[PDB]
Amino acid sequence: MFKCFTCEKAADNYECNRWAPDIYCPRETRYCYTQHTMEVTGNSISVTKRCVPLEECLSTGCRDSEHEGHKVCTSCCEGNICNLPLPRNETDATFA
């Protein structure tokens, strides 16, 4: 469980890591936040990554969101350099 890259306004995780900006995550951050914005159909439109404390990663989960249009899922990491590309499937959590 280490830090990750602070991506922002990126078209895809691939190119995002391909460059790997020479920066460093903020303080009071142990977990890694991940937010991928997809289109209504199911295409990667944008993605954002940043470091966040356990508190911020207390409640997360990825799923299909077709309310207004674009579907974006949220999730956290548990390892170093978690800027890897995510799969493409339907998942459901309990979030009890």
Coordinates of N, CA, C and O in Angstrom, one line a residue:
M1 N 0.8 -1.2 0.0 CA 0.0 0.0 0.0 C 0.9 1.3 0.0 O 1.2 1.8 1.1
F2 N 1.2 1.7 -1.2 CA 2.0 2.9 -1.3 C 1.3 4.0 -2.0 O 0.1 3.9 -2.2
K3 N 2.0 5.1 -2.4 CA 1.4 6.2 -3.1 C 1.3 5.9 -4.6 O 1.8 5.0 -5.1
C4 N 0.6 6.8 -5.3 CA 0.4 6.7 -6.8 C 0.6 8.0 -7.5 O 1.0 9.0 -6.9
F5 N 0.3 8.0 -8.8 CA 0.5 9.2 -9.6 C -0.8 10.1 -9.5 O -1.9 9.6 -9.5
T6 N -0.6 11.4 -9.4 CA -1.7 12.3 -9.3 C -2.2 12.8 -10.7 O -1.8 13.8 -11.2
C7 N -3.0 12.0 -11.4 CA -3.5 12.3 -12.7 C -4.6 13.3 -12.6 O -5.3 13.4 -11.6
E8 N -4.9 13.9 -13.7 CA -6.0 14.9 -13.8 C -6.3 15.3 -15.3 O -5.4 15.5 -16.1
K9 N -7.6 15.3 -15.6 CA -8.1 15.6 -16.9 C -7.3 14.8 -18.0 O -6.9 15.3 -19.0
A10 N -7.2 13.5 -17.7 CA -6.5 12.6 -18.6 C -7.5 11.8 -19.5 O -8.5 11.3 -19.0
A11 N -7.1 11.6 -20.7 CA -8.0 10.9 -21.7 C -8.0 9.4 -21.3 O -9.0 8.8 -21.5
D12 N -6.8 8.9 -20.9 CA -6.7 7.5 -20.6 C -5.6 7.3 -19.6 O -4.6 8.1 -19.5
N13 N -5.7 6.2 -18.8 CA -4.7 5.9 -17.8 C -3.3 5.6 -18.5 O -2.3 5.8 -17.9
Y14 N -3.4 5.0 -19.7 CA -2.2 4.6 -20.4 C -1.3 5.8 -20.6 O -0.2 5.9 -20.0
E15 N -1.7 6.8 -21.4 CA -0.9 8.0 -21.7 C -0.5 8.7 -20.4 O 0.6 9.2 -20.2
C16 N -1.5 8.6 -19.4 CA -1.2 9.3 -18.1 C 0.1 8.7 -17.5 O 0.9 9.5 -17.1
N17 N 0.2 7.4 -17.5 CA 1.4 6.8 -16.9 C 2.6 6.9 -17.8 O 3.7 7.1 -17.4
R18 N 2.3 6.8 -19.1 CA 3.4 6.9 -20.1 C 4.2 8.2 -19.9 O 5.4 8.1 -20.1
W19 N 3.6 9.2 -19.4 CA 4.4 10.5 -19.1 C 4.9 10.5 -17.7 O 6.0 10.8 -17.4
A20 N 4.0 10.1 -16.7 CA 4.4 10.0 -15.3 C 5.0 11.3 -14.9 O 6.2 11.4 -14.7
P21 N 4.2 12.4 -14.7 CA 4.6 13.7 -14.3 C 5.6 13.6 -13.1 O 5.3 12.9 -12.1
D22 N 6.7 14.4 -13.1 CA 7.6 14.4 -12.0 C 7.1 15.2 -10.9 O 7.5 16.4 -10.6
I23 N 6.1 14.6 -10.1 CA 5.5 15.3 -9.0 C 5.4 14.4 -7.8 O 5.9 13.2 -7.9
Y24 N 4.8 14.8 -6.7 CA 4.6 14.0 -5.5 C 3.3 14.3 -4.9 O 2.8 15.4 -4.9
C25 N 2.6 13.2 -4.4 CA 1.3 13.3 -3.7 C 1.4 14.2 -2.5 O 2.5 14.5 -1.9
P26 N 0.2 14.8 -2.1 CA 0.1 15.6 -0.9 C 0.4 14.9 0.4 O 0.8 13.7 0.4
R27 N 0.2 15.6 1.5 CA 0.4 15.0 2.8 C -0.9 14.3 3.4 O -1.9 14.2 2.6
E28 N -0.9 13.9 4.6 CA -2.0 13.2 5.2 C -2.8 12.3 4.2 O -4.0 12.3 4.1
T29 N -2.0 11.6 3.4 CA -2.6 10.7 2.4 C -1.9 9.3 2.4 O -0.7 9.2 2.3
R30 N -2.7 8.3 2.7 CA -2.2 7.0 2.7 C -2.8 6.1 1.6 O -2.2 5.2 1.1
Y31 N -4.1 6.4 1.3 CA -4.8 5.6 0.3 C -4.7 6.3 -1.1 O -4.2 7.4 -1.2
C32 N -5.2 5.6 -2.1 CA -5.1 6.2 -3.5 C -6.5 6.2 -4.1 O -7.2 5.2 -4.3
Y33 N -7.0 7.4 -4.4 CA -8.3 7.6 -5.0 C -8.3 7.5 -6.5 O -7.3 7.9 -7.1
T34 N -9.3 6.8 -7.0 CA -9.4 6.6 -8.5 C -10.8 6.9 -9.0 O -11.8 6.3 -8.5
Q35 N -10.9 7.7 -10.0 CA -12.2 8.1 -10.6 C -12.1 8.1 -12.2 O -11.4 8.9 -12.7
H36 N -12.7 7.1 -12.8 CA -12.7 7.0 -14.2 C -14.1 7.4 -14.8 O -15.1 6.9 -14.5
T37 N -14.1 8.4 -15.7 CA -15.3 8.9 -16.3 C -15.5 8.3 -17.7 O -14.7 8.5 -18.6
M38 N -16.6 7.5 -17.9 CA -16.9 6.9 -19.1 C -18.1 7.5 -19.8 O -18.8 8.2 -19.2
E39 N -18.3 7.2 -21.1 CA -19.4 7.7 -21.8 C -20.7 6.9 -21.6 O -20.6 5.8 -21.0
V40 N -21.8 7.3 -22.1 CA -23.1 6.6 -22.0 C -23.0 5.2 -22.6 O -23.5 4.2 -22.0
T41 N -22.3 5.1 -23.7 CA -22.2 3.8 -24.4 C -21.2 2.9 -23.7 O -21.6 1.8 -23.3
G42 N -20.0 3.4 -23.4 CA -19.1 2.6 -22.6 C -17.6 2.8 -23.1 O -16.8 1.9 -23.2
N43 N -17.3 4.1 -23.4 CA -16.0 4.4 -23.9 C -15.3 5.3 -22.9 O -15.9 6.2 -22.3
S44 N -14.0 5.2 -22.7 CA -13.2 6.0 -21.8 C -13.1 7.4 -22.4 O -12.5 7.7 -23.4
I45 N -13.8 8.3 -21.6 CA -13.8 9.7 -22.0 C -12.8 10.5 -21.3 O -12.1 11.4 -21.8
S46 N -12.7 10.2 -20.0 CA -11.7 10.9 -19.1 C -11.5 10.1 -17.8 O -12.2 9.2 -17.5
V47 N -10.4 10.5 -17.1 CA -10.0 9.8 -15.9 C -9.2 10.7 -15.0 O -8.4 11.5 -15.4
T48 N -9.4 10.6 -13.7 CA -8.7 11.4 -12.7 C -8.2 10.6 -11.5 O -8.9 9.7 -11.0
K49 N -6.9 10.8 -11.1 CA -6.3 10.0 -10.1 C -5.6 11.0 -9.1 O -5.0 11.9 -9.5
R50 N -5.8 10.7 -7.8 CA -5.1 11.5 -6.7 C -5.0 10.7 -5.4 O -5.8 9.8 -5.2
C51 N -4.1 11.1 -4.6 CA -3.9 10.5 -3.3 C -4.9 11.0 -2.2 O -5.2 12.2 -2.2
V52 N -5.4 10.2 -1.4 CA -6.4 10.6 -0.3 C -6.2 9.7 0.9 O -5.8 8.5 0.8
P53 N -6.6 10.3 2.1 CA -6.5 9.5 3.3 C -7.5 8.4 3.5 O -8.5 8.4 2.7
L54 N -7.3 7.5 4.4 CA -8.2 6.4 4.6 C -9.7 6.9 4.7 O -10.6 6.3 4.2
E55 N -9.8 8.0 5.4 CA -11.1 8.6 5.6 C -11.8 8.9 4.3 O -13.0 8.6 4.2
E56 N -11.1 9.4 3.3 CA -11.7 9.7 2.0 C -12.0 8.4 1.3 O -12.9 8.4 0.4
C57 N -11.3 7.3 1.6 CA -11.5 6.1 1.0 C -12.2 5.1 1.9 O -12.1 3.9 1.8
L58 N -13.1 5.7 2.8 CA -13.9 4.9 3.7 C -15.0 4.2 3.0 O -15.4 3.1 3.3
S59 N -15.6 4.9 2.0 CA -16.7 4.4 1.3 C -16.5 4.6 -0.2 O -16.5 5.8 -0.7
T60 N -16.3 3.5 -1.0 CA -16.1 3.6 -2.4 C -16.8 2.5 -3.1 O -17.5 1.6 -2.5
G61 N -16.7 2.4 -4.4 CA -17.4 1.4 -5.2 C -17.6 1.8 -6.7 O -17.8 3.0 -7.0
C62 N -17.5 0.8 -7.6 CA -17.6 1.1 -9.0 C -18.9 0.4 -9.5 O -19.2 -0.8 -9.1
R63 N -19.6 1.0 -10.4 CA -20.8 0.5 -11.0 C -21.2 1.3 -12.2 O -20.6 2.3 -12.6
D64 N -22.3 0.9 -12.8 CA -22.8 1.6 -14.0 C -23.8 2.7 -13.6 O -24.7 2.5 -12.9
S65 N -23.4 3.9 -14.1 CA -24.2 5.1 -13.8 C -24.7 5.8 -15.0 O -24.0 6.4 -15.8
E66 N -26.0 5.6 -15.3 CA -26.7 6.2 -16.5 C -27.8 7.1 -16.1 O -28.9 7.1 -16.6
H67 N -27.5 8.0 -15.1 CA -28.5 9.0 -14.6 C -28.6 10.1 -15.6 O -29.6 10.3 -16.3
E68 N -27.6 11.0 -15.7 CA -27.6 12.1 -16.6 C -27.0 11.7 -17.9 O -27.4 12.3 -18.9
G69 N -26.0 10.8 -17.9 CA -25.4 10.4 -19.2 C -24.1 9.6 -18.9 O -24.1 8.4 -18.8
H70 N -23.0 10.3 -18.9 CA -21.7 9.7 -18.7 C -21.7 8.9 -17.4 O -22.3 9.3 -16.4
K71 N -21.1 7.7 -17.5 CA -21.0 6.8 -16.4 C -19.6 6.8 -15.8 O -18.6 6.4 -16.4
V72 N -19.5 7.2 -14.5 CA -18.2 7.3 -13.8 C -18.2 6.4 -12.6 O -19.2 6.5 -11.8
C73 N -17.2 5.6 -12.4 CA -17.1 4.8 -11.2 C -15.9 5.2 -10.3 O -15.0 5.8 -10.7
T74 N -16.1 4.9 -9.0 CA -15.1 5.3 -8.0 C -14.5 4.1 -7.3 O -15.2 3.1 -7.0
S75 N -13.2 4.2 -6.9 CA -12.6 3.1 -6.2 C -11.2 3.5 -5.7 O -10.6 4.5 -6.1
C76 N -10.7 2.7 -4.7 CA -9.4 3.0 -4.2 C -8.4 1.9 -4.5 O -8.8 0.8 -5.0
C77 N -7.1 2.1 -4.1 CA -6.1 1.1 -4.4 C -5.6 0.6 -3.1 O -6.0 0.9 -2.0
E78 N -4.6 -0.4 -3.2 CA -4.1 -1.0 -2.0 C -2.6 -1.4 -2.2 O -2.0 -2.1 -1.4
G79 N -2.0 -0.8 -3.3 CA -0.6 -1.1 -3.6 C 0.1 0.1 -4.2 O -0.6 1.1 -4.6
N80 N 1.4 0.0 -4.3 CA 2.1 1.1 -5.0 C 1.9 1.2 -6.5 O 1.5 0.2 -7.1
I81 N 2.1 2.4 -7.0 CA 1.8 2.6 -8.4 C 0.6 1.9 -8.9 O 0.6 1.0 -9.7
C82 N -0.6 2.3 -8.4 CA -1.9 1.7 -8.8 C -2.5 2.5 -9.9 O -3.7 2.6 -10.0
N83 N -1.7 3.1 -10.8 CA -2.2 3.8 -11.9 C -2.3 2.9 -13.1 O -2.4 3.4 -14.3
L84 N -2.4 1.6 -12.9 CA -2.6 0.6 -14.0 C -4.0 0.7 -14.5 O -4.9 1.2 -13.9
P85 N -4.1 0.2 -15.8 CA -5.4 0.2 -16.5 C -6.4 -0.7 -15.8 O -6.1 -1.9 -15.5
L86 N -7.7 -0.2 -15.6 CA -8.7 -1.1 -15.0 C -9.5 -1.8 -16.1 O -9.5 -1.5 -17.3
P87 N -10.1 -3.0 -15.7 CA -10.8 -3.8 -16.6 C -12.1 -3.2 -17.1 O -12.4 -2.0 -16.8
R88 N -13.0 -4.0 -17.7 CA -14.3 -3.5 -18.2 C -15.4 -4.5 -18.0 O -15.6 -5.4 -18.8
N89 N -16.1 -4.4 -16.9 CA -17.1 -5.4 -16.5 C -18.1 -4.7 -15.5 O -17.9 -3.6 -15.1
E90 N -19.1 -5.5 -15.2 CA -20.1 -5.0 -14.2 C -19.9 -5.6 -12.8 O -19.8 -6.8 -12.7
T91 N -19.7 -4.7 -11.9 CA -19.5 -5.1 -10.5 C -20.5 -4.5 -9.5 O -21.0 -3.4 -9.8
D92 N -20.8 -5.2 -8.4 CA -21.7 -4.6 -7.4 C -21.2 -4.9 -6.0 O -20.8 -6.0 -5.7
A93 N -21.2 -3.9 -5.2 CA -20.8 -4.1 -3.8 C -22.0 -4.0 -2.8 O -23.1 -3.9 -3.2
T94 N -21.7 -4.2 -1.5 CA -22.7 -4.2 -0.5 C -22.9 -2.8 0.1 O -24.0 -2.4 0.4
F95 N -21.8 -2.1 0.2 CA -21.8 -0.7 0.8 C -22.8 -0.6 1.9 O -23.6 0.3 2.0
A96 N -22.9 -1.6 2.8 CA -23.8 -1.7 3.9 C -23.4 -0.7 5.0 O -24.1 -0.5 6.0

